[PDB]
């Protein structure tokens, strides 16, 4: 019952297992480094950096608890644990994914407020507002997926424990669409507006003569990483509720969504001015 | 211009050269004696019990 | 003109010879016999947060419970040390405050800075709101240290190489102290109030007659600017802190340097210097973000007070010697004991 | 500094009124304000208290709910909305200043007084003698006692002494039972121990004739003494 | 534990803290600018023109943005012991005139030295600089009176305004020993009226945008 053995996946299990191990290792090391940097430096507890800290918590939780089990199941094509553990594993996985998406959206909003309307950011992100936002994201991530407690099983198409696709279809598909629109809007629009503001500020100075190469790269990297990691999975499991696609597309989507936990630490700590130089000097 | 400054400097140095002075040993002994006499009434040097301390713990 | 230069050189040589004759025994040799003070452990009993900019100076009240602190945010905050409560918050006219002072009787608190003016505030006015009493103008350079000689007259040290004594009620400087080549950076009154000593950027400290109004002695030996200076409790010695990363002890009667407090690992300047009640300890702030407690008699590092994230800008030991409060540029005052 | 107050008059039982206190000559926005009422012939009786910024409001249990105390800092005035009065509410009402910080002198200034006439656990403070004859140039000691010791843990004996000159509002003499109020002749010297207090006058002279009211401040409601009247 | 007036004092302290926080938040939004240069380089002329015994504070307002300009030229005292109090200033305004060759006590080179010291000061690593190349108008005839050869023997271009002005701008910007950390904004005021404040606002908003980008991690 709890097996995903198949001939089609025979030539694809090893690559998925290797990629999962790489994702686990890289995400874990990056997130623990980020948390150590936050803990060591009291100046990194900035009003904005708490969102990045929450995102780091989500990626760390995923890449530490959920990913090893998934890669083990991929390797052995068998859900070693029981259904009682699935009911928790699927919920934790999907809550981690939802919290990561929501925190990415909130980071985009915070960046847009900082760059376009600096005098406004404190108002929305007030003293109690930061804890309010983090708690709201976490409670949403857990609650929106808890009702699927009876629906979490070892889905064969993915060889890992998650929500059954056939019977949870309506609610789960609506939830997935709500992250398709919300996430891709809150990322693309906000980063485009940030680029617009930066370009306008830079251009206003050109008239006194007789968008930097970094901001554009950073925005493009953020949006492209989010899209590549999430949109394939959401699109595949929204457009095709019935399980008839080959077993590789779902596994490819699983790999791409795994990429998010591995990459977010890079984009949000490694390329960040505050973390990079400070922790490098400390080392 | 500089004549006044030079005169003032010379006068000040001459006034300084006429001050009384004592051996360094006597000065060091006096400092040591003062430090020893008031050692028992120095809280930083000799911490006092928490009851007498006014900056107690939370 | 050259005759005056030759006479000055001869007088300086005579001063050097006379001071050399007095140094019969170094302080280190005589104090080597005494037992050394053990490692001094101090912890932050209070953290007086509330300032939103660099702390540049602080002063204790004679009651050992009230202290004042000035900062670039433009506020003088009078703290209740025992409970961390704010007692007052004076908004300065000019936010470039480089010093502050608490009157002996506690009625007045004064401050000044780049505005070139020493302001005096009434803390016990009938109206109930601390208000400026008088603005002592007349200086040509930034103020670096103010100390209330009396409830009616104070002595100020400016950045124009001059220290002046002010009559608060009249509002004009009765006596002007001149003779510093460089701008004065700190000041300290003798316990008996008859004399005060100031150190300037010319790497020399001067001893002045408050009443007579003339210099008495000049002490040299520092390699760089003297940021801070303090009187030994007995009143017959004072310790200076300079940018060359060494504190030194001068004696008035011996009229020469007496001991130097330097360490190889200490390479940055001193921002403030203070003495313990008995004088056996010589605390001094440093630009390396922490203060070091120096054994005033053996010159050994008896302890360290770390805990500030930026340069420590001021410190002072209560009149009863119960605590030492250090203020730093990170806008936090911590009271150790 | 000056505290005018008004609003008094003849009121039928069960009516209402809005006493007004106008503050002029001091930073009214930072002073806690009290309402102290004195019966036509009895001693003072605390009524209500409002802190700076109106954060904390207290009422005497005898008048809780009946009255409401409010302030308007921009208008520099203190209000006491009183409703459902009774025969016991006929009394002078004194708008009493109060500022609380380390070393302050609360109750330093008292309003003139408004005459309101209505048509027809607490610490107990007792004063030994109601009246004591006095002569100029003599020394007089006035003794007071509380129910429980007023020496709080921090070391302050929260007891106050007030002198009510005949026909004038009382003025603070001594605060915390040892500290001397500013502007007094300095002859008075208050001293005492826990739960036992006394006030000493050296070289008694004219203008010292009046009634002396003790007041604790350890915890609300504040309780005044009956009063000791000096007679020449 | 606390008595009555102890609680009252704690309430007073909390009120004072609230007022302190409000004032600090109000002051944080204000833009602080430091004004430097020689006294005769047109500092007074520009500050008085562009207005909407110690430190002189000037207040402006432009596009709902509040400026604080600290003209410290009156401090005829040793620097390096009060400059560190200007660490947090958002930007530094530097006024240099192009009509100072005649006065020798070497003025153009004194301005060069001052610019080098102020740009490379350890307290102004991040603080961007805003140059004002004043006295442009009369410079047009002054250069005709004295070609640029009198000041730059290494100058290779022609003795014309369009070339000399650019050469001077590159000479000043090259003096920056740290290109990446801080940027330099140059403007040829020529005693114009509205362009000075507009340029200050544009440079300030660019600096603020880049500061936010650094803080939020985009840079
Ligand atoms: C409604 C919000 C959805 C957020 C999307 C989370 C996607 C990660 C979940 C996942 C599922 C799966 O079957 C296999 C696998 O590796 N990972």
**DSSP string computed for C291-329:** EEEEETTT--EEEEEE--SS-EEEEEE-TTSS-EEEEET
Judged by a CB distance cut-off of 8 A, whether residue C170 touches chain E is no
Chosen for mutation from A49, A111, A202, A211 (greatest number of chain E CBs closer than 10 Å) is: A111
Query: Residue D98: phi, psi to the nearest 5?
Result: -165, 125
Q: Considering only the beta carbons, identify the residue of C52, C84, C201 that sits closest to E78.
A: C201
CA distance C236 to C234: 6
Residue E44 burial (10 A CB sphere; 0-12, 13-18, 19+): middle
Residue A254 CB less than 6 A away from ligand 1: yes
- Residue C112 Ramachandran class (φ > 0 left, ψ -120 to 50 alpha, else beta): beta
CATH assignment of the domain containing E145:
3.40.50.300
Instruction: Tell me the CATH number for domain A8-282.
Output: 1.20.1070.10
CA distance D59 to D80: 11
DSSP symbols for C88-110 = EEEEPSSS-EEEEEE-TTSSEEE
Total domain count for chain E?
A: 1
D98 and D30 belong to one structural domain: yes
User: Which residues, 6 or more positions from D173, have their beta carbon under 8 angstroms from its beta carbon?
Assistant: D161, D162, D163, D180, D181, D184, D188, D190, D199, D212
Residues C112 and C146: beta-carbon distance below 8 Å: yes
Residues D145 and D126: beta-carbon distance below 8 Å: yes
Listed residue (C226, C319, C336, C230) closest to C274, CA to CA: C230
Residues A31 and A63: beta-carbon distance below 8 Å: yes
- Which DSSP letter does residue C189 get? E
Element (H, E) at B12: helix B2-17
Judged by a CB distance cut-off of 8 A, whether residue E29 touches chain C is no
What number of other Cβ atoms are within 10 A of residue B56's Cβ? 11
DSSP symbols for E62-126 = ETTEEEEEEE-TT--S-SSSSGGGGTT-SEEEEEEES--TT----HHHHHHHHHHHHHH-GGGSS
| C/D Cβ contact: 3+ pairs below 8 Å | yes
Element (H, E) at A131: helix A127-143
- Residue D167 Ramachandran class (φ > 0 left, ψ -120 to 50 alpha, else beta): left
Listed residue (E122, E124, E116, E96) closest to E108, CA to CA: E96
CATH assignment of the domain containing D133:
2.60.40.10
Q: What is the SS3 assignment for A126?
A: coil
Residues A172 and E173: beta-carbon distance below 8 Å: no
Torsion of CA C78, C80, C84, C88, to 10 degrees: -30
Judged by a CB distance cut-off of 8 A, whether residue C237 touches chain B is yes
Q: What is the SS3 assignment for C266?
A: coil
CA distance A173 to A182: 14
Q: Whose CA is nearest to atom 6 of ligand 1?
A: A97
User: Which residues, 6 or more positions from E208, have their beta carbon under 8 angstroms from its beta carbon?
Assistant: A118, E31, E90
DSSP symbols for A66-105 = IHHHHHHHHHHTB--S-HHHHHHHHHHHHHHHHHHHHHHH
The tokens of C312 are what? 């420590």
Mutate which of A92, A251, A256, A257 for ligand 1? The one with the most ligand atoms within 8 Å of its CB, which is A257
Residues A222 and E217: beta-carbon distance below 8 Å: no
The total number of residues shown for chain A amounts to: 283
Beta strand segments in chain A, E: 152-155, 160-163
Q: Mark which residues 69-98 of C lie under 8 Å from D by CB.
A: 80, 83, 85, 87-88
- Give the pairing type, strands C290-295 and C281-286: antiparallel
What number of other Cβ atoms are within 10 A of residue C304's Cβ? 15
Atom of ligand 1 nearest to the CA of A178: 1
Residues C284 and C294: beta-carbon distance below 8 Å: yes
What is the strand order of the sheet C324-328 is part of? C44-48, C333-336, C324-328, C312-317
Residues C291 and C312: beta-carbon distance below 8 Å: yes
Residues C186 and C199: beta-carbon distance below 8 Å: yes
Listed residue (E124, E106, E107, E147) closest to E34, CA to CA: E124
Largest CA distance in chain A: 76
CA distance D101 to C86: 9
Residue A155 CB less than 6 A away from ligand 1: yes
- Which DSSP letter does residue C129 get? S
Which structural domain, as residue segments, surrounds residue E73?
A: 27-216
What is the strand order of the sheet C173-177 is part of? C143-147, C153-158, C163-167, C173-177
Write the CA distances from D143 to C62, C157, D1, D191, integer angstroms: 34, 53, 32, 10
D38 and D108 belong to one structural domain: yes
Are D101 and E12 inside 8 Å of each other by CB? Answer: yes
Beta bridge partner(s), residue E201: none
Residues E61 and C127: beta-carbon distance below 8 Å: no
Chosen for mutation from E2, E12, E15 (greatest number of chain D CBs closer than 10 Å) is: E12
Determine the distance separating the centroid of ligand 1 and the alpha carbon of A93, expressed in angstroms.
Answer: 7
Residue A260 CB less than 6 A away from ligand 1: no
Which structural domain, as residue segments, surrounds residue B17?
A: 3-55
Write the CA distances from A184 to A188, A192, C266, integer angstroms: 6, 12, 55
DSSP symbols for E137-205 = HHHHHHHHHS-GGGT-TT--S-SSHHHHHHHHHHHHHHT-S-TTT--EEEE--TT-SHHHHHHHHHHHH
Calculate ∠ Cα D178-D181-D185, nearest 5°.
105
Determine the distance separating the centroid of ligand 1 and the alpha carbon of A238, expressed in angstroms.
Answer: 12
- Cis peptide bond N-terminal to D59, omega within 30: no
E30 to chain C, minimum CA–CA distance in Å? 12
Judged by a CB distance cut-off of 8 A, whether residue C279 touches chain E is no
Token pair 């109601």 is at which residue? D130
The tokens of E205 are what? 């908003």
Integer Rg of chain A from CA:
20
Q: What is the SS3 assignment for A223?
A: helix
Determine the distance separating the centroid of ligand 1 and the alpha carbon of A257, expressed in angstroms.
Answer: 7
CA distance E171 to E165: 10
Chain E residues near residue C183 by CB distance under 8 angstroms: 77-78, 81
CA distance E93 to E88: 14
- Give the pairing type, strands C256-261 and D159-164: unpaired
Residues C32 and B33: beta-carbon distance below 8 Å: no
Residue A187 CB less than 6 A away from ligand 1: no
Residues E148 and E75: beta-carbon distance below 8 Å: no
Listed residue (A24, A37, A59) closest to A265, CA to CA: A59
Of D70, D85, D118, the one marking the end of a domain is D118
Residues E134 and E95: beta-carbon distance below 8 Å: yes
CA distance E190 to E76: 28
Burial C263-275, CB ≥16 within 10 A → b, else e: eeebeebbbbbbb
| E2 lies in some domain | no
Judged by a CB distance cut-off of 8 A, whether residue C129 touches chain D is yes
Q: Considering only the beta carbons, identify the residue of D25, D26, D101 that sits closest to C87.
A: D101
The tokens of A64 are what? 């530490």
Listed residue (D144, D92, D91, D112) closest to D24, CA to CA: D112
Token pair 């002859």 is at which residue? D187
Token pair 């009046």 is at which residue? D210
CA distance D104 to D114: 27
Are E15 and D220 inside 8 Å of each other by CB? Answer: no
CA distance B22 to C23: 9
Of D86, D118, D150, the one marking the end of a domain is D118
Calculate ∠ Cα D43-D49-D51, nearest 5°.
145
CA distance A130 to A110: 11
CA distance D159 to D190: 10
CA distance C294 to D157: 41
Are C323 and B28 inside 8 Å of each other by CB? Answer: no
Listed residue (C173, C181, C263) closest to C213, CA to CA: C173
Query: Residue E107: phi, psi to the nearest 5?
Result: -70, -40
Q: By CA distance, what is D182's nearest residue in C? A: C126
Residues C79 and C86: beta-carbon distance below 8 Å: yes
Residues E167 and E155: beta-carbon distance below 8 Å: yes
Listed residue (B34, B40, B45, B38) closest to C281, CA to CA: B45
Residues E126 and E165: beta-carbon distance below 8 Å: no
Element (H, E) at A43: none
What number of other Cβ atoms are within 10 A of residue A49's Cβ? 26
Residues E99 and E108: beta-carbon distance below 8 Å: no
| E/B Cβ contact: 3+ pairs below 8 Å | no
CA distance A20 to A14: 10
Q: By CA distance, what is D99's nearest residue in C? A: C128
Residue A176 CB less than 6 A away from ligand 1: yes
Q: By CA distance, what is C84's nearest residue in E? A: E13
Name the neighbours of B, counting chains with at least 3 Cβ pairs within 8 A. C
Chain C residues near residue D99 by CB distance under 8 angstroms: 128
Number of CB pairs, chain D paired with chain E, less than 8 A apart: 40
Beta bridge partner(s), residue C187: C198
CATH assignment of the domain containing B30:
4.10.260.10
Of D118, D146, D176, the one marking the end of a domain is D118
The tokens of C169 are what? 């009620």
Listed residue (A89, A83, A87) closest to A66, CA to CA: A89
Total domain count for chain D?
A: 2
**How was this one solved?**
cryo-EM
Judged by a CB distance cut-off of 8 A, whether residue E29 touches chain A is yes
Listed residue (C55, C61, C59, C60) closest to C75, CA to CA: C55
CA distance A98 to A140: 8
Residue A257 CB less than 6 A away from ligand 1: yes
- Which DSSP letter does residue D122 get? P
CA distance D17 to C243: 70
CA distance D142 to D136: 16
Query: Residue C272: phi, psi to the nearest 5?
Result: -160, 150
Residues D26 and C130: beta-carbon distance below 8 Å: no
| E4 lies in some domain | no
Determine the distance separating the centroid of ligand 1 and the alpha carbon of D188, expressed in angstroms.
Answer: 83
- Give the pairing type, strands E31-37 and E91-97: parallel
Domain extents for chain A? 8-282
User: E134: number of CA atoms within 13 Å, CB side?
Assistant: 25
Which of the listed CATH numbers 2.130.10.10, 3.30.1490.20, 2.60.40.10, 3.40.50.300 matches domain C1-336? 2.130.10.10
Listed residue (A148, A60, A68, A131) closest to A96, CA to CA: A60
Mutate which of A91, A254, A261 for ligand 1? The one with the most ligand atoms within 8 Å of its CB, which is A254
Residues D96 and D35: beta-carbon distance below 8 Å: yes
Token pair 């609300």 is at which residue? D220
Resolution in Å, one decimal place: 3.2
Listed residue (B5, E2, E158) closest to C5, CA to CA: B5
Beta bridge partner(s), residue C143: C158
CA distance C136 to C170: 10
Which structural domain, as residue segments, surrounds residue D226?
A: 126-230
What number of other Cβ atoms are within 10 A of residue B40's Cβ? 9
CA distance C50 to C167: 33
- Residue C193 Ramachandran class (φ > 0 left, ψ -120 to 50 alpha, else beta): left
The tokens of A212 are what? 């930097």
The tokens of D199 are what? 């006030």
CA distance C98 to C103: 17
Q: What is the SS3 assignment for D176?
A: coil
Total domain count for chain B?
A: 1
A212-220: which pairs have CB atoms within 8 A and are 24 or more residues apart? Answer: A212/E219, A214/E218, A214/E219, A215/E213, A215/E218, A215/E219, A218/A267, A218/A271, A218/E217, A218/E218, A219/A191, A219/A192, A219/A194, A219/A195, A219/E218
User: Which residues, 6 or more positions from C80, have their beta carbon under 8 angstroms from its beta carbon?
Assistant: C65, C66, C86, C87, D101, D102, E9, E13
CA distance C188 to C59: 12
CA distance C42 to C307: 11
Determine the distance separating the centroid of ligand 1 and the alpha carbon of A98, expressed in angstroms.
Answer: 9
| E/D Cβ contact: 3+ pairs below 8 Å | yes
Listed residue (C49, C45, C54, C53) closest to C311, CA to CA: C54
CA distance A117 to E216: 13
Are E209 and A197 inside 8 Å of each other by CB? Answer: yes
Listed residue (C303, C70, D90) closest to E85, CA to CA: C70
Q: Mark which residues 163-222 of D lie under 8 Å from C by CB.
A: 182
| E164 lies in some domain | yes
Query: Residue E176: phi, psi to the nearest 5?
Result: -65, 115
Judged by a CB distance cut-off of 8 A, whether residue E76 touches chain C is yes
Residue A218's Cα: distance from chain center in Å? 17
CA distance D213 to D200: 14
Domain extents for chain C? 1-336
User: Which residues, 6 or more positions from C215, have their beta carbon under 8 angstroms from its beta carbon?
Assistant: B12, B16, C177, C179, C206, C207, C208, C209
Query: Residue E162: phi, psi to the nearest 5?
Result: -60, -30
Mutate which of A12, A20, A97 for ligand 1? The one with the most ligand atoms within 8 Å of its CB, which is A97
DSSP symbols for D2-30 = EEEEE--SEE-TT-EEEEEEEEESS-GGG
CA distance E213 to A115: 7
Judged by a CB distance cut-off of 8 A, whether residue E12 touches chain D is yes
CA distance D213 to D125: 10
């Amino acid at each position: 019952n709890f097996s995903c053995y198949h001939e089609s996946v025979l030539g694809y299990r090893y690559v998925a297992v290797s990629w999962g191990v790489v994702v686990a290792v890289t995400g874990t090391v990056g997130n623990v480094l980020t948390l150590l940097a936050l803990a060591i430096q009291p100046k990194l507890r900035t009003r904005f950096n708490l969102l990045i800290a929450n995102l780091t918590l989500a990626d760390l939780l995923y890449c530490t608890l959920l990913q090893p089990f998934s890669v083990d199941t991929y390797l052995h094509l068998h859900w070693r644990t029981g259904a009682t553990f699935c009911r928790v594993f699927g919920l934790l996985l999907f809550a981690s994914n939802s919290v990561s998406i929501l925190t990415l959206c909130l980071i985009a909003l915070g960046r847009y407020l900082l760059i376009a309307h600096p005098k406004l950011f404190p108002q929305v992100f007030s003293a109690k507002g930061i804890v309010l936002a983090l708690v709201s994201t976490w409670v949403v991530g857990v609650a929106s997926f808890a009702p699927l407690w009876p629906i979490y099983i070892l889905v064969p198409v993915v060889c890992t424990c998650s929500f059954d696709r056939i019977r949870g279809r309506p609610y789960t598909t609506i939830l997935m669409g709500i992250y398709f629109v919300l996430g891709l809007s809150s990322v693309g629009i906000f980063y485009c507006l940030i680029h617009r503001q930066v370009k306008r500020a830079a251009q206003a100075l050109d008239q006194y003569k007789l968008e930097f190469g970094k901001v554009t790269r950073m925005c493009f990297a953020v949006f492209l990483c989010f899209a590549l990691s999430y949109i394939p999975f959401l699109l595949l499991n929204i457009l095709d509720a019935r399980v008839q696609a080959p077993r590789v597309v779902h596994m490819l989507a699983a790999n791409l969504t795994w990429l998010n936990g591995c990459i977010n630490p890079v984009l949000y700590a490694a390329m960040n001015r505050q973390f990079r130089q400070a922790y490098g000097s400390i080392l | 211009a500089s004549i006044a400054q030079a005169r003032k400097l010379v006068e000040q140095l001459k006034m300084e050269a006429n001050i009384d002075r004592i051996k360094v040993s006597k000065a060091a002994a006096d400092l040591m004696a003062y430090c020893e006499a008031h050692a028992k009434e120095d809280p930083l040097l000799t911490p006092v019990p928490a009851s007498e301390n006014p900056f107690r713990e939370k | 003109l050259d005759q005056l230069r030759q006479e000055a050189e001869q007088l300086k040589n005579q001063i050097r010879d006379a001071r050399k004759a007095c140094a019969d025994a170094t302080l280190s040799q005589i104090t080597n016999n005494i037992d050394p003070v053990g490692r001094i452990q101090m912890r932050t009993r209070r953290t007086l947060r509330g300032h939103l900019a660099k702390i540049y100076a602080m002063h204790w009240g004679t009651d050992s419970r009230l202290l004042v602190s000035a900062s670039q945010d433009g506020k003088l905050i009078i703290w209740d040390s025992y409970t961390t409560n704010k007692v007052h918050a004076i908004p300065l006219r000019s936010s470039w405050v480089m010093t502050c002072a608490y009157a002996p009787s506690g009625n007045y608190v004064a401050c000044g800075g780049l505005d070139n003016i020493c302001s005096i505030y009434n803390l016990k006015t009938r109206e109930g709101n601390v208000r400026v009493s008088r603005e002592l103008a007349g200086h040509t350079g930034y103020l670096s240290c103010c100390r209330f000689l009396d409830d009616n007259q104070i002595v100020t040290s400016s950045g124009d190489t001059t220290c002046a004594l002010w009559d608060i009620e009249t509002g004009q400087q009765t006596t002007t102290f001149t003779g510093h080549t460089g701008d004065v950076m700190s000041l300290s009154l003798a316990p008996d109030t008859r004399l005060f000593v100031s150190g300037a950027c010319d790497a020399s400290a001067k001893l002045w007659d408050v009443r007579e109004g003339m210099c008495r002695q000049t002490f040299t030996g520092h390699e760089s600017d003297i940021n801070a200076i303090c009187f030994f409790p007995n009143g017959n010695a004072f310790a200076t802190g300079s940018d060359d990363a060494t504190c030194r002890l001068f004696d008035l009667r011996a009229d020469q340097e007496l001991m130097t407090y330097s360490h190889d690992n200490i390479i940055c300047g001193i921002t403030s210097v203070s003495f313990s009640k008995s004088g056996r300890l010589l605390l001094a702030g440093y630009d390396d973000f922490n203060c070091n407690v120096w054994d005033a008699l053996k010159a050994d590092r008896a302890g360290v007070l770390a805990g500030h994230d930026n340069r420590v800008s001021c410190l002072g030991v209560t009149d009863d010697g119960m605590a030492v409060a250090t203020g730093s540029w990170d806008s936090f005052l911590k009271i150790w004991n | 500094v000056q505290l005018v107050e008004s609003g008094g008059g003849l009121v039928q039982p069960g009516g209402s009124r809005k006493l007004s206190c106008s503050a002029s000559g001091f930073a009214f926005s930072s002073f806690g304000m009290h309402w102290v009422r004195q019966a036509p012939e009895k001693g003072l009786e605390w009524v209500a208290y409002i802190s700076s910024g109106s954060g904390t409001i207290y009422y005497a249990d005898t008048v809780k709910g009946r009255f409401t105390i409010s302030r308007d800092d921009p208008k520099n005035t203190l209000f006491l909305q009183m409703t459902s009065l009774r025969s016991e509410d006929t009394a002078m009402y004194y708008c009493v200043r109060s500022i609380y910080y380390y070393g302050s002198s609360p109750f330093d200034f008292w309003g003139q007084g408004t005459t309101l006439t209505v048509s027809s656990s607490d610490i107990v403070m007792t004063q030994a003698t109601s009246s004591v004859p006095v002569t100029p140039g003599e020394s007089v000691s006035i003794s007071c006692r509380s129910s429980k010791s007023l020496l709080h843990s921090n070391g302050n004996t929260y007891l106050y002494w007030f002198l009510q000159r005949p026909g004038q509002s009382p003025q603070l003499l001594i605060y915390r039972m040892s500290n001397l109020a500013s502007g007094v002749p300095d002859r008075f010297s208050g001293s005492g121990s826990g739960t036992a207090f006394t006030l000493t006058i050296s070289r008694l002279e004219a203008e010292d004739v009046g009634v002396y009211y003790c007041m604790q401040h350890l915890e609300y409601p504040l309780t005044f003494g009956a009063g000791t009247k000096l007679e020449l | 534990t606390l008595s009555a007036e102890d609680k009252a004092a704690v309430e007073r302290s909390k009120m004072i803290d609230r007022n302190l926080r409000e004032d600090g938040e109000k002051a944080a939004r204000e833009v602080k600018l430091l004004l430097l240069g020689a006294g005769e380089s047109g500092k007074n002329t520009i500050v008085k023109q562009m207005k909407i015994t110690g430190i002189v504070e000037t207040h402006f307002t432009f596009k709902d943005l509040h400026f604080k300009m600290f003209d410290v030229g009156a401090q005829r005292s040793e620097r390096k012991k009060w400059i560190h109090c200007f660490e947090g200033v958002t930007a530094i305004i530097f006024c240099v005139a192009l009509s100072d060759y005649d006065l020798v006590l070497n003025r153009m080179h004194a301005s060069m030295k001052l610019f080098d010291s102020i740009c490379n000061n350890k307290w102004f690593t991040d603080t961007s600089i805003i140059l004002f190349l004043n006295k442009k108008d009369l410079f047009e005839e002054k250069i005709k009176k004295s070609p640029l050869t009198i000041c730059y023997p290494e100058y290779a271009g022609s003795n014309t305004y369009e070339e000399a002005a650019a050469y001077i701008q590159c000479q000043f910007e090259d003096l920056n020993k740290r290109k990446d950390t801080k940027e330099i904004y140059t403007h040829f005021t020529c005693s114009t009226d509205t362009k000075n404040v507009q340029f200050v606002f544009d440079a300030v908003t660019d600096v603020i945008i880049k500061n936010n980008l650094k803080d939020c991690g985009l840079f």
